């Protein structure tokens, strides 16, 4: 199916720019930036939309695919093909960054693929909640942040309201992902996307970071998987209730 | 009225991206930035305009609503419905950030919701003028800065002059709010919006910051409420006098 | 003449965002930035073009007015009316920033309007070349940098080549002024505009900074006045020779 | 041939904004930035596309010219004329920055044009791989990074898929070069362009930096020349296989 390779290609490109920006922020502090993370993932989404926006819609996100189907906009038969396409692309993008930044991660870490400590590198690929946070509040943040993403996504592409001019939606959508990081990313790393979080964390477990990538943060791994699903659905519902009312 | 929920939805979204960016700048200095505050509020306005620009005009600002009515552009009957819509949305967005950043504010402040000191957090939600400033100069800044906002807003949307191409005004308007922060925000925190300032400060008084959120800065709270009203009106007048002359 | 007030209004707005960004960089280092200076002047130009692009062309720059007339594009009779319009607007924008940042400049400087020392403030309004530079190389930089501005301006607005889509030229032009600062501003402060430099420096001499604002840097003041005139003309010539060849 | 001067003019402009941004990052740390390097080269590409996008396509890059010809999109006879046009423009842009930043480089370096040490300046013009890297991994990075550039370039300009709206492709293309730096530039300096790397390094050898500009990094100079050629070709192939499948 053409929507499989479209979701694969757009998610791969998006995650390369994304996870590469995060690797920059962690590895070097003269070449890395939290703002660069916001820009790398944001405008990384802009490139993916140019890749697959006209073929599959360029979801690059299992939450917005789940929310579109659960809202009667995409047939339920296309949910597995969309999810596996972005899961495979995100997995391969994690392997891409790991190999491109290999000696950079090695020299920085001295050869220790660590998840805790002042030299940890697991946070490049997946999300790990800071020490000041609780798992329930991380669920609340991921749900609310994905809700903001879905509500704002509908408004940018709503041809019956006030959408971005066609041919520029790629810009406005990337800017939304930029400011979601700038304004809401410190508390959880704004995963807002199961395809962005679980495939790279699965890669880190196989790569050699071990099993603590899953158990860190009171078994944190499942929250970026199900919390955005509830968030994206809730966000889309509130817009559709806001629209026509 | 549809313009009530439109102003509510756009102001809520705008203030979430706004107050979240400010929380970042205060809480963490590796994930926060004054430029991020400029971007979070700026492109936060961009998302609100996509939400309500075609339904209500996406004022998200009692000064531009007051200036539009006082300039004979919006009927005076729509002033209370617009103001309460953005006041309620801004109030709820302040409660949204407080709950999402709850333990972040607690761990940073040790459990003390303070307004002064090296660990104060009241400045996340509302404006507090720096020690080098006077209340009269804060009135002058808020009036002049809102005047710049209203004059520039008219120019960006003036279909009879040189406006932004339709479908891209959301971008240009956000950029205006970005540079108002970059170029003019240090002296007062560029409130430029009664709906942005008073509802979150009222929330901080109820949340537990106490009554000093109102008395700080020689009873500073009323200036972001009335000074932008005079500024936006003056700014719009000078453009309309500049136009057709 | 309508082009007088258009050049006045657009230059005033541009210089408020410009000189305010520079004041930020000098006064506070948590709220100020060299990148913010690049953004404040860059997208400040974007707002001016929306003000006067359709009425006068939004020159906001005596070099591009001189280059347009000397290239047979604007009648020579409109050179004095354009220059005095932007000179008056830039002068009043310098007075605007000085009054808005008054106590900020006073508290930072302790009450001393100084041009040298670790607490100087004259550099907010006009340009002063660093100690590592020579006056001849400052002439070379201002000429080459204005040449880049004029050549790139023609390309962005050349309806017979590859211009920015109408209604978005304000964006692309501001971005050009951003990167001229980012890439070429350290050596001279990229004045690239007599209207940007001389009127604010004249204001600083009257405001109380004294006469060293003119004599600093081996009588530096005249270079941002005549060097951009030669630069803009040369830059425009090379494009017009490049076009149709 | 008009495509010669078009490639010359666009590459010259692009490299002036590019190499000037890098000079900023190296020479001063209050006026320079790695993000500024990303912006200077990124939106420098935006200006070049406005110069030559409609005349020659604004390649400004021997890898994308090689990839276009090897993919049957540009006649093979136009490969030498395109390459020498951008090589000459990039060479002259390197001489432009060296003369504009002359005393800045001299005062910073005390008069020593050095390639190693805490005061080296050769990295302004060409790429030098960090100490934590291997030459083979630098080949892998330059190939993969140019592949990302070519794949994303096709998607932005594919009139049969989801391209940027005509008249705005200059913006989206520059943004792509920005995030390639933000997300992937630390490991190699993302040369992604033989015309960007070899001509300035040849200039540094003649300027007086000596022969170590070529021998540094296990004879690093040839990798930015041939690795992007393989990368751009591979990236374009994968898109064209992705398209229509």
From Swiss-Prot, chains A, B, C, D:
Enzymatic reactions: glycerol(in) = glycerol(out); H2O(in) = H2O(out); urea(in) = urea(out)
Motif NPA 1 per UniProt: ranges: 61-63
Transmembrane segments: 4-21, 35-52, 79-99, 138-155, 168-184, 221-242
Top-rank taxon: Eukaryota
Site description Important for permeability to glycerol, residues in chain: 102
Topology of the protein relative to the lipid bilayer: Multi-pass membrane protein
Post-translational modification: Phosphorylation by PKA could prevent the interaction with PLIN1.
GO molecular function, one term: water channel activity
GO cellular component terms listed in the entry, alphabetical order: basolateral plasma membrane; cell-cell junction; cytoplasm; cytoplasmic vesicle membrane; lipid droplet; plasma membrane
Chain ranges on the Cytoplasmic side, renumbered to this chain: 53-56, 71-78, 156-167
Summary of activators and inhibitors of this protein: Glycerol transport is regulated by pH, with the porin being permeable to glycerol at pH 7.4 but not at pH 5.5. Water permeability, however, is not influenced by pH. Inhibited by mercury ions.
Compartment(s) where it occurs, according to its Swiss-Prot or TrEMBL record: Cell membrane; Cytoplasmic vesicle membrane; Lipid droplet
Intramembrane residue ranges: 57-70, 189-202
Homology family: Belongs to the MIP/aquaporin (TC 1.A.8) family.
Assembly mode: Homotetramer; each monomer provides an independent glycerol/water pore. Two homotetramers on opposing membranes can dimerize, forming a cell-cell junction. Interacts with PLIN1.
Protein name according to UniProt: Aquaporin-7
Region of the whole protein represented: 34 to 278 of 342
